[PDB]
């Protein structure tokens, strides 16, 4: 069934607004196309399953239509969908651009507020957000390594990236430097292999523990010479003896071999501790 | 608990 | 459009070959995946686009396919592109690994053979090469300070590095010690501030003269106690008078103040001589 596509006019409409108007005028007929003023928009009492084009996503009018439950998208969504001959998204929430379309994310090991922010900005950039980790997830967003979800995503060979990736995607999109999430390079935003790990060793010679310390710091973790409880997450230990080892065992701290550490570096993520126990 | 490092033996 | 992937088998393929063979199967079905011997490779005689995998980049087969213009890449490009979820380069020339991917260089103040050699190994390591210095250039490679390109790159605060950096990148890559150009430390390969300068002083007291000599030698330059014809590139001299000054002038040697020298040290590159004239 037919549905109107209304363009919200204002005193200072952006370049994106007019660009979307010209592209929709060039790839669809003007029969279901209106231009409405702020007056006519404020007066709308009810959501009429039509599509509104706001810029920016702020102000009395945007707040009004959002409260009514209207299907709102930014002009960059129109330009994108027109250019790639693809459908306008469902838009249960307002969608400002399509930079993160085809991206489905889940989060782990994040602060609640940080997660809500990632959810918000991913939703605004045309991506999808899942609480739990399912097959359709394309990227995991993580603040630390280690969690069950982290490991699951790693076994599926999915990218595990930092919130900074989202931040850069948003900022770079507002600076009109990127059209697509692939324009920035993923590896500059990977989650470090040992981010959140606090590693101690025992039984290793001085050169071994200096190498472990150097690599730990290089790969985002922290190294400790002394074992401190409520701090150390992993004790690297090849042979199960010594005061460090037994203290770690009384505190149920991960006691793993060196193969855990170096395998974690080689395979690009923090390995499952359970396979490397002693 | 806290345990110091194995000294350079 | 088609995207064939053929694998060249040989007597002594490296472990990289088998790793890439096992890794490449986990994305697409074996519908476009072949293993070809030297015979069947030799028998082909025209470029059918397609993707070839050689190891090493030498032999009758490599010479054949390269001289025909085929699209050849090494297995390390497969391992890299798979691991980092990024595309395989187009490669008009063969590309052996991705250690220098995202690196774009230009050269200045190099011998013809040295420049061509740098071009070769950078192109082989997945980098890009520009004849002229453009904003997209990430690193400048220089054999001496002083040239217009050197000054331009310095004003853009771009790294100015020695060809040895490329060599280390190559060698450390063949020894499987590095996966990425960031693993080695860039500072250890900076171009010295005065590399190629032959500095003389006049009118300075003995302590000043000694300081200038010490710093000159320390920062890669050469010091001369006596102004000579042609040999000396810069005469440090505060006031335009004396036989040293006039001789330096009628030999077209740079006559600059000490402020040129110490500013050059402070700001980390060889400053523009024209600003420091006397």
DSSP output for C140-191: EEESSS-SHHHHHHHHTT--EE-HHHHHHHHHHHHTT--SSTTSS-GGGGBP
Domains of chain C by start residue, with CATH = 1-95 (3.40.50.10190), 96-193 (3.40.50.10190), 194-278 (no CATH)
| CB nearest B6 (choices: A202, A229, A247) | A202
Contacts of C79 in chain A (CB under 8 A): none
Contacts of C84 in chain A (CB under 8 A): 186-187
CA dihedral (A272, A273, B1, B4) positive or negative: negative
**Rounded Cα gap, residues C4 and C52, in angstroms:** 9
Q: Which of A201, A207, A226 to mutate to test the interface with B (most CBs of B within 10 A)?
A: A226
**Rounded Cα gap, residues A223 and A198, in angstroms:** 6
Q: Do A187 and C84 touch (CB under 8 A)?
A: yes
Sorted by sequence, the CB contacts under 8 Å of residue A50 that are 6+ apart come out as A3, A4, A5, A6, A70, A71
- The CA distances from residue C6 to A159, C2, C50, C70, C72, in Å, are 27, 13, 8, 12, 10
- The CA distances from residue C49 to A49, A232, C36, C72, in Å, are 49, 54, 16, 10
For chain C, give the number of residues: 278
Q: Which residue, chain included where needed, has tokens 């929430």? A: A93
Strand arrangement, sheet containing A128-129? A128-129, A104-108, A139-142, A160-161
**Rounded Cα gap, residues A194 and C124, in angstroms:** 32
| DSSP-assigned letter for residue A55 | S
- The CA distances from residue A136 to A39, A153, A163, A180, A271, in Å, are 42, 11, 20, 19, 23
The resolution, in Å, is: 2.8
Q: Which residue, chain included where needed, has tokens 């499952």? A: A272
Q: What angle do CA A100, A106, A107 make, to 5 degrees?
A: 115
Structure tokens at A250: 């009384």
Identify whether the C-beta of residue A56 lies closer than 8 Å to the C-beta of residue A66. Answer: no
Structure tokens at A16: 């994106």
Where helices occur in chain A by DSSP H, the ranges are 15-27, 38-43, 60-68, 75-83, 112-124, 148-155, 163-174, 206-218, 243-250, 258-267
Q: Is A93 helix (H, G, I), strand (E, B) or coil?
A: coil
Q: What is the dihedral of CA A192, A196, A197, A198, to 10 degrees?
A: 130
Q: Give the gap in angstroms from C-alpha C177 to the nearest C-alpha of chain A.
A: 12
| DSSP-assigned letter for residue B5 | P
**Rounded Cα gap, residues A47 and A66, in angstroms:** 10
**Rounded Cα gap, residues C272 and C278, in angstroms:** 13
* Residue C204 CB-density burial (10 A; 0-12 exposed, 13-18 middle, 19+ buried): middle
Q: Is A99 helix (H, G, I), strand (E, B) or coil?
A: coil
Structure-determination approach: X-ray
Identify whether the C-beta of residue A272 lies closer than 8 Å to the C-beta of residue A222. Answer: no
- From first CA to last CA, the distance across chain B in angstroms is 23
Cβ neighbour number for residue A65 with a 10 Å cutoff:
20
User: Which of A204, A209, A267, A270 minimizes the C-alpha distance to A237?
Assistant: A204
User: Which of A191, A196, A192, A208 minimizes the C-alpha distance to A258?
Assistant: A208
CA dihedral (A195, A197, A198, A201) positive or negative: negative
**Contacting subunits of C (3+ beta carbon pairs below 8 A):** A
Structure tokens at A154: 């790693």
- The CA distances from residue A166 to A139, C86, C263, in Å, are 11, 18, 41
Structure tokens at C120: 């070769």
Cβ neighbour number for residue A182 with a 10 Å cutoff:
14
Measured between CA atoms, the residue of chain C closest to residue A154 is: C83
Query: Furthest-apart CA pair in chain C: how many Å?
Result: 82
Q: Do A186 and C85 touch (CB under 8 A)?
A: yes
Q: Which residue, chain included where needed, has tokens 């996966």? A: C179
Identify whether the C-beta of residue A159 lies closer than 8 Å to the C-beta of residue A185. Answer: no
Q: Which residue, chain included where needed, has tokens 């460090």? A: A244
Identify whether the C-beta of residue C230 lies closer than 8 Å to the C-beta of residue C251. Answer: yes
Identify whether the C-beta of residue C254 lies closer than 8 Å to the C-beta of residue C227. Answer: no
C8-37 burial: b if 16+ Cβ within 10 Å, else e: bbeeebeebbeebbeebeeeeeeeeeeebe
Sorted by sequence, the CB contacts under 8 Å of residue C269 that are 6+ apart come out as C145, C150, C154, C160, C193
Strand arrangement, sheet containing A5-8? A33-36, A5-8, A51-53, A71-73
Q: C15 φ, ψ to 5°?
A: -65, -30
Element at C267 (helix H, strand E): helix C258-267
CB contacts < 8 A, A to C, total 9
| DSSP-assigned letter for residue A276 | G
Contacts of A225 in chain B (CB under 8 A): 4-5
**Rounded Cα gap, residues C97 and C110, in angstroms:** 25
**Rounded Cα gap, residues A236 and A256, in angstroms:** 5
Beta pairing, strands A254-256 & A234-236: parallel
* Residue C261 CB-density burial (10 A; 0-12 exposed, 13-18 middle, 19+ buried): buried
User: Which of A194, A185, A162, A165 minimizes the C-alpha distance to A269?
Assistant: A194
Q: What angle do CA A198, A200, A203 make, to 5 degrees?
A: 165
β partners of residue C35 = C7
Sorted by sequence, the CB contacts under 8 Å of residue C84 that are 6+ apart come out as A186, A187
Sorted by sequence, the CB contacts under 8 Å of residue A185 that are 6+ apart come out as C86, C102
Q: Is A214 helix (H, G, I), strand (E, B) or coil?
A: helix
**Rounded Cα gap, residues A185 and C81, in angstroms:** 12
Q: Is A163 helix (H, G, I), strand (E, B) or coil?
A: helix
Contacts of C26 in chain A (CB under 8 A): 157
Sorted by sequence, the CB contacts under 8 Å of residue A236 that are 6+ apart come out as A199, A200, A201, A202, A204, A212, A256, A257, A258, A260, A261
Q: Angle, to 10 degrees, between the axis of helix A15-27 and the axis of helix A75-83? A: 40
Q: Angle, to 10 degrees, between the axis of helix A206-218 and the axis of helix A258-267? A: 30
Structure tokens at C209: 């003269």
Does residue A229 sit at the B interface (CB-CB below 8 Å)?
A: yes
Cβ neighbour number for residue A157 with a 10 Å cutoff:
13
Identify whether the C-beta of residue A201 lies closer than 8 Å to the C-beta of residue A127. Answer: no
């Amino acid at each position: 069934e037919p549905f109107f596509v209304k363009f919200l006019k204002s005193s200072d409409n952006s370049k994106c607004f007019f660009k979307a108007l010209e592209s929709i005028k060039e790839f669809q007929s003007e029969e279901y196309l209106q231009i409405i003023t702020e007056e006519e928009a404020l007066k709308i009492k009810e959501n009429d399953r039509s599509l509104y084009i706001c810029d920016p996503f702020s102000g009395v009018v945007f707040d009004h239509l959002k409260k009514l439950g209207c299907r709102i998208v930014g002009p960059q969504v129109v330009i994108f969908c027109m250019h790639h001959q693809r459908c306008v998204p469902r838009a249960e929430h307002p969608v400002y651009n399509m930079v993160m379309s085809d991206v489905t994310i889940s989060c782990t090991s994040l602060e609640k507020e940080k997660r809500e922010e990632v959810h918000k900005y991913v939703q605004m950039m045309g991506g999808r957000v899942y609480r739990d980790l399912n097959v359709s997830v394309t990227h995991l967003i993580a603040g630390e390594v280690g969690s069950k979800k982290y490991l699951v995503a790693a076994n599926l060979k999915k990218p595990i990236l930092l919130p900074s990736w989202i931040k850069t995607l948003w900022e770079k999109s507002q600076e009109k430097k990127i059209t697509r999430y692939t324009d920035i390079n993923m590896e500059d935003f990977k989650c470090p292999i040992f981010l959140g790990c606090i590693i101690c060793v025992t039984g290793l010679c001085g050169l071994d523990r200096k190498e472990v310390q150097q690599l730990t710091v290089k790969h985002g973790g922290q190294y400790m010479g002394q074992l401190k409880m409520n701090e150390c997450t992993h004790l690297i230990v090849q042979e199960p003896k010594g005061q460090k080892y037994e203290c770690a065992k009384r505190w149920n701290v991960h006691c793993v071999t060196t193969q855990w550490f170096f395998d974690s570096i080689e395979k690009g993520f923090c390995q499952d501790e359970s396979i490397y126990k002693t | 608990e806290e345990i110091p490092e194995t000294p350079c033996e």
